[PDB]
Design an enzyme around this catalytic site. Structure first.
Site, mmCIF file in Angstrom:
data_model
loop_
_atom_site.group_PDB
_atom_site.id
_atom_site.type_symbol
_atom_site.label_atom_id
_atom_site.label_comp_id
_atom_site.label_asym_id
_atom_site.label_seq_id
_atom_site.Cartn_x
_atom_site.Cartn_y
_atom_site.Cartn_z
ATOM 1 N N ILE B 12 38.874 37.888 36.484
ATOM 2 C CA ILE B 12 39.321 37.486 35.153
ATOM 3 C C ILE B 12 38.878 38.552 34.150
ATOM 4 C CG2 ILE B 12 39.259 35.750 33.315
ATOM 5 C CD1 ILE B 12 38.302 33.782 35.537
ATOM 6 N N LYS B 13 39.840 39.187 33.507
ATOM 7 C CA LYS B 13 39.619 40.232 32.514
ATOM 8 C C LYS B 13 39.780 39.625 31.129
ATOM 9 C CE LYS B 13 41.988 41.370 35.485
ATOM 10 N NZ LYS B 13 42.236 40.862 36.894
ATOM 11 N N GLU B 70 52.794 37.668 32.984
ATOM 12 C CA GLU B 70 52.011 38.871 33.277
ATOM 13 C C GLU B 70 52.696 40.231 33.324
ATOM 14 O OE1 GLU B 70 49.939 40.009 37.139
ATOM 15 O OE2 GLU B 70 50.309 37.893 37.518
ATOM 16 N N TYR B 137 31.384 43.621 47.298
ATOM 17 C CA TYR B 137 32.428 44.641 46.888
ATOM 18 C C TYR B 137 31.928 46.011 46.669
ATOM 19 C CZ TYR B 137 36.124 47.170 44.518
ATOM 20 O OH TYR B 137 37.051 48.076 44.088
HETATM 21 N N1 LIG Z 1 33.523 43.192 40.975
HETATM 22 C C1 LIG Z 1 34.537 43.034 41.835
HETATM 23 N N2 LIG Z 1 34.570 42.039 42.692
HETATM 24 C C2 LIG Z 1 35.600 41.836 43.507
HETATM 25 N N3 LIG Z 1 36.583 42.748 43.534
HETATM 26 C C3 LIG Z 1 36.646 43.819 42.763
HETATM 27 C C4 LIG Z 1 35.595 44.011 41.822
HETATM 28 N N4 LIG Z 1 35.846 45.147 41.114
HETATM 29 C C5 LIG Z 1 37.051 45.602 41.582
HETATM 30 N N5 LIG Z 1 37.521 44.840 42.598
HETATM 31 C C6 LIG Z 1 38.784 45.106 43.284
HETATM 32 O O1 LIG Z 1 39.890 44.795 42.405
HETATM 33 C C7 LIG Z 1 40.797 43.953 43.110
HETATM 34 C C8 LIG Z 1 41.527 43.033 42.096
HETATM 35 O O2 LIG Z 1 42.086 43.791 41.028
HETATM 36 P P1 LIG Z 1 42.724 43.088 39.659
HETATM 37 O O3 LIG Z 1 43.578 44.148 38.955
HETATM 38 O O4 LIG Z 1 41.531 42.484 38.960
HETATM 39 O O5 LIG Z 1 43.484 41.925 40.426
HETATM 40 P P2 LIG Z 1 43.817 40.339 40.020
HETATM 41 O O6 LIG Z 1 44.493 40.332 38.670
HETATM 42 O O7 LIG Z 1 44.720 39.919 41.132
HETATM 43 O O8 LIG Z 1 42.448 39.711 40.087
HETATM 44 C C9 LIG Z 1 39.960 43.210 44.075
HETATM 45 O O9 LIG Z 1 40.785 42.752 45.138
HETATM 46 C C10 LIG Z 1 38.975 44.243 44.542
HETATM 47 O O10 LIG Z 1 39.637 45.152 45.451
HETATM 48 C C1 LIG Z 2 57.095 38.440 52.628
HETATM 49 C C2 LIG Z 2 56.585 39.851 52.210
HETATM 50 C C3 LIG Z 2 56.551 39.910 50.694
HETATM 51 C C4 LIG Z 2 55.965 41.209 50.306
HETATM 52 C C5 LIG Z 2 56.341 41.334 48.869
HETATM 53 N N1 LIG Z 2 55.296 40.656 48.121
HETATM 54 C C6 LIG Z 2 55.233 40.816 46.794
HETATM 55 O O1 LIG Z 2 56.077 41.483 46.153
HETATM 56 C C7 LIG Z 2 54.036 40.130 46.103
HETATM 57 C C8 LIG Z 2 53.037 41.243 45.845
HETATM 58 N N2 LIG Z 2 52.039 40.838 44.895
HETATM 59 C C9 LIG Z 2 52.189 40.976 43.619
HETATM 60 O O2 LIG Z 2 53.268 41.423 43.224
HETATM 61 C C10 LIG Z 2 51.002 40.470 42.807
HETATM 62 O O3 LIG Z 2 49.866 40.170 43.671
HETATM 63 C C11 LIG Z 2 51.278 39.103 41.978
HETATM 64 C C12 LIG Z 2 50.012 38.603 41.206
HETATM 65 C C13 LIG Z 2 51.739 38.072 43.013
HETATM 66 C C14 LIG Z 2 52.386 39.350 40.936
#
Ligand SMILES: Nc1ncnc2c1ncn2[C@@H]1O[C@H](COP(=O)(O)OP(=O)(O)O)[C@@H](O)[C@H]1O
Ligand SMILES: CCCCCNC(=O)CCNC(=O)[C@H](O)C(C)(C)C
Ligand SMILES: Nc1ncnc2c1ncn2[C@@H]1O[C@H](COP(=O)(O)OP(=O)(O)O)[C@@H](O)[C@H]1O
Ligand SMILES: CCCCCNC(=O)CCNC(=O)[C@H](O)C(C)(C)C
Lengths: 266, 266
Positions: B12-13, B70, B137
């Site tokens: 969560i950002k 998003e 991580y």
């Molecule tokens: N502190 C952390 N803990 C867990 N994962 C991290 C951390 N920092 C970076 N990552 C990496 O970033 C990835 C998620 O990126 P992000 O852009 O935040 O994704 P989402 O919006 O799906 O959470 C994680 O899967 C991991 O590879």
């Molecule tokens: C059945 C194989 C599907 C592969 C294609 N999957 C996708 O395009 C989903 C990839 N993931 C994303 O685009 C991101 O993680 C979100 C958060 C789901 C937008």
């Protein structure tokens, strides 16, 4: 007899032709010395070679051989098999899923390579070994068919939970992205293997549909030995191709497209 | 005070804004209850949410929030960051490498989604766990940084035994495809993890450069938290983008693109 051979990184594919009778043979690249031996004992009218290991065969045989680039040969054999099997496709992507994966756009007359990726059968075997210690291909693929990916892969709906997702909820969002949520799990060799095939299939398909869009074709032909004894891979690829609005095709003896092709470039 | 939150599958950002000036914070999605607790105590002028878990936030807080999709939020925020960091790109692909990967073409005015794939940060953690039994991580990513992929990956030059390959010999032909040729000895966690990071990078880059060709742009902007603490990932991606004739861009606080964009969407 006329002989075409596609000597790849993992499998040697050998087609023998006399009269209109064909023989489709596969041998291990590990056993290439036995192929050369066999060849040296035969009466061969014409020998055509392609593949990364074509040179190895050529330097160890006692007869001249024509050598063709495998992209042209695959495209040539594939067209021959499509025609025979009643597919009259105006144009198509073909994805050659071998040790690695090479993508081609066939414009109705000739092929151009339009991408590739290292996810393919070599990854299925290698990553599969790191994750199961199985080296036997039949063993590995049979086991994978008994697997469930659900505690390993994360879907779009797991991320969007109870809200409306921006793309359909049942799509894979993150391969292996559920693992950290199931550390109570054990992660069975079958389930792990199914997830490796899952990622390979999804990546190949994604790339294939992307280039299909780019080169304005709706047809995708999948060849390569990686489909052999792997119904899960066939299914992953087929389902996802259909889901993105394309038409997948497999071809009887597709893995020998290059071996056949070599014979008919001569 | 105004708050934009991108609540994704792993992280969560949070962006807080006051006198035009911003503070950035992340929290694990697993600790979402703590984010909710923090929001409920705050007097907030404007609260804007995006991402998969925005629903979960919105249904547990005791104040109102506006929710944005998003893909649009990420595009808006990345355009803000790019200009603040002195870039003037007319158009580009952006690859948002989160839990999974989503790809977009930005034409100078608006974004279109042009594909996605399940190879991204979630795969690095989950597959990385399976091969290494590391869940931390920073520990998992640090372990990979000086790994050696040589015994694990197969290159084009390995398949083309002494003969000239039809594409660059130094290209990866099969990720994990050298494993069966190196069964003699142990596969170390560092080396396995460097191979995981390599397959994720190469797949993401392959998709990004394919769509860049398709939409006729040489610019590729890479965002997402997956690049944090992973210099090797950045390098796999940057090197191959440059080899494909494209220009890669990383953005300071790029992972907060959606959080920033939620604040500025109308
Ligand atoms: N502190 C952390 N803990 C867990 N994962 C991290 C951390 N920092 C970076 N990552 C990496 O970033 C990835 C998620 O990126 P992000 O852009 O935040 O994704 P989402 O919006 O799906 O959470 C994680 O899967 C991991 O590879
Ligand atoms: C059945 C194989 C599907 C592969 C294609 N999957 C996708 O395009 C989903 C990839 N993931 C994303 O685009 C991101 O993680 C979100 C958060 C789901 C937008
Ligand atoms: N008997 C087998 N032994 C090993 N691998 C096989 C066999 N049958 C099918 N395969 C699959 O086929 C892959 C090789 O495909 P192929 O199209 O012959 O590639 P190449 O031309 O690169 O050797 C292997 O990596 C494996 O996934
Ligand atoms: C560094 C990223 C490179 C990934 C792209 N790799 C490729 O295009 C090669 C994939 N492999 C294949 O095409 C086949 O295995 C051959 C036999 C090398 C043609």
């Amino acid at each position: 007899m006329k002989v075409g051979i596609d000597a790849g990184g993992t499998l040697i594919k050998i087609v023998q032709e006399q009269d209109n009778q064909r023989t489709f043979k596969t041998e291990l690249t590990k056993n290439i010395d036995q192929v050369v031996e066999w060849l040296n004992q035969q009466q061969i009218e014409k020998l055509c070679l392609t593949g990364g290991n074509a040179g190895v065969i050529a330097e160890n045989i006692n007869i001249p051989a024509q050598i063709f680039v495998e992209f042209d040969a695959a495209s040539q054999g594939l067209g021959i098999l499509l025609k025979e099997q009643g597919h009259d496709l105006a144009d198509y992507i073909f994805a050659n899923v071998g040790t690695g994966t090479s993508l081609h756009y066939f414009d109705g007359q000739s092929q151009r390579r339009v991408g590739g990726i290292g996810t393919g059968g070599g990854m299925i075997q290698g990553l599969g070994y790191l994750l199961s210690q199985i080296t036997d291909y039949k063993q590995l693929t049979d086991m994978a068919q008994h697997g469930d990916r659900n505690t390993i892969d994360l879907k779009v709906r797991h991320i969007y939970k109870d809200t409306e997702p921006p793309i359909p909820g049942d799509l894979t969002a993150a391969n292996f992205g559920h693992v950290l949520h199931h550390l109570d799990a054990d992660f069975t060799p079958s389930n792990k293997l199914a997830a490796v095939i899952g990622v390979v299939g999804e990546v190949v398909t994604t790339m294939a549909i992307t280039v299909a869009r780019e080169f304005k074709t709706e047809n995708i032909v999948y060849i390569g030995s990686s489909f052999h004894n792997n119904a899960l891979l066939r299914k992953v690829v087929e389902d996802y191709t259909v889901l993105r609005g394309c038409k997948p095709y497999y071809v009887e003896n597709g893995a020998f497209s290059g071996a056949i092709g070599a014979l008919y470039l001569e």
